[PDB]
Amino acid sequence: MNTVPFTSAPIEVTIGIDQYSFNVKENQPFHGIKDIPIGHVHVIHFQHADNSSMRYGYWFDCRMGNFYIQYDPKDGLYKMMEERDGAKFENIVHNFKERQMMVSYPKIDEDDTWYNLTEFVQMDKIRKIVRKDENQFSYVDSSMTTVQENELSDPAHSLNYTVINFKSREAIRPGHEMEDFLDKSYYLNTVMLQGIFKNSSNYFGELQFAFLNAMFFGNYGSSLQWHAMIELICSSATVPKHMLDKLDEILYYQIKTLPEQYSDILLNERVWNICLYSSFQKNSLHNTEKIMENKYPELL
């Protein structure tokens, strides 16, 4: 079980670790998060108490190195940093644990929520979507734009999601205009799955990563990407049976986890109505349709 120590907490902040969060007071003796499950990516995230537009965080995997958080009073944020001296790191963590100044990653033993939300998400794929190759962890925030959003400004600070555009030459074979527009099977299976993602696992990885960035940071372009990747499957007549069964599970846990009070901003009425009620796959997402109908029946 791994540990992300903190140097200090000089400014009052809500700290998120995956789906959990807690309030830390200005100069409270907080020195970090222990008992973080090995085997999954994690996200530590922040919202300053004095400025709620400061909403940002770090994707990391404790198997890849020893990471800590230190507030930078110049740039005015909690920064992730890698400690390359193993023995120093272990000595620092040991002191903070002994003096019990760390919160415990509060995982219920029965609870597979985080696994279910991150099943296909890999740190190496995150680092291709978020380019900063000198760090093993990836910074995201509420305002970062997508490559697609920047086509329709700063290219170094963008989310490099796979561009999906239903009215593009990539999506439509010359001579198959009506066929390819009304049945997106070609675009899903040949262009995206076989061509770009190589397999459904990388496609689901990017879909789950887009959802999590939408939910944890309110990142608008991530929300667009999550819905585009859902609509591309639901609008395809020919999808492998395993992919549909897996999509239903993925979406079920995403809808389960979504805070009720953010449904109005994080869910697109047109996409969900089309996907559950009009699309080729309208009868293929049993679990997702039942939780959507019981939790968000106004949206539909």
Binding site: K167, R169, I172, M178, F181
Partner: protein, 254 residues
């Protein structure tokens, strides 16, 4: 964006544009079967593609053979329209290609945008104008060429005959829309007004009669009264009580 009353002069500027009307592409007669069920029988249709500045009409005849063994014909009709418009643009020299295509029905936007992905600089626009282009099949010579077709065919007309020798494209378009509005509201009456006088004929190479400038004023007045008379017959309104501001608005309103 959307072509409306506000941006109406844009039709007669020097940027090449085409209107596309798909109303007459898929046409059926509904009839009873021997078993007392209902069946459709398709008849020949046409795409109405018009340069409102020049009067040039690209009438693509849609032969019933197009529909043989196809399903969802009302949806296919939009995609076949977009395919034929796309083929027409690709057939024109670059300097004759339109800069904009205005579709009379919003359902044509996606089919045409997808067929025109090769032409990113051609704007595909809807209109807020309720244009009476469905009444094209009330023009005897256009009806005649569509119904006689035995195969897919493109036929080229000038829907303004020689009017642009004497009037602007703005006025020519207004005359065309008034004639088509009248034909659409009361075809028999409209035809009676146009063809009553045996002395005024249609040249072999024209669609409409050879009216003098004064005779066109009388005709246009008779067409406006027909539209008013029918709006009176329709809504049970005394058209005597109507003012000139009341009259003007109900014709435009349409």
């Amino acid at each position: 964006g959307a072509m409306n009353s506000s941006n109406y002069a844009e039709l007669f500027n020097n940027d090449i544009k085409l209107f596309v009307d798909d109303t007459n592409v898929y046409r059926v007669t509904v009839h009873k079967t021997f078993e007392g069920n209902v069946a459709t029988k398709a008849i020949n249709g046409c795409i109405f593609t018009l340069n409102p500045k020049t009067g040039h009409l690209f009438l693509k005849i849609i032969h019933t053979s197009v529909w043989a063994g196809q399903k969802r014909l009302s949806q296919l009709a939009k995609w076949k329209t977009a395919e034929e418009v796309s083929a027409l643009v690709r057939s024109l020299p670059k300097e004759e290609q339109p800069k904009q295509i205005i579709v009379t029905r919003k359902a044509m936007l996606d089919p045409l945008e997808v067929h025109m992905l090769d032409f990113p600089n051609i704007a595909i626009r809807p209109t807020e104008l309720r244009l009476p282009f469905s009444a094209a099949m009330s023009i005897d010579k256009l009806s005649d060429v569509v119904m006689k077709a035995t195969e897919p065919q493109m036929v080229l007309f000038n829907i303004y005959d020689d009017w642009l020798d004497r009037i602007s494209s703005y006025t020519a378009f207004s005359r065309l829309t008034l004639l088509l509005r009248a034909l659409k509201t009361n075809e028999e009456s409209a035809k009676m007004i146009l063809l009553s006088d045996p002395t005024i004929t249609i040249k072999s190479y024209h669609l409409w009669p050879s009216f003098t400038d004064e005779q066109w004023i009388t005709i246009e007045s008779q067409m406006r009264d027909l539209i008013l008379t029918e709006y009176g017959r329709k809504y049970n309104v005394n058209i005597s009580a109507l003012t000139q501001t009341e009259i003007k608005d109900i014709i435009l309103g349409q």
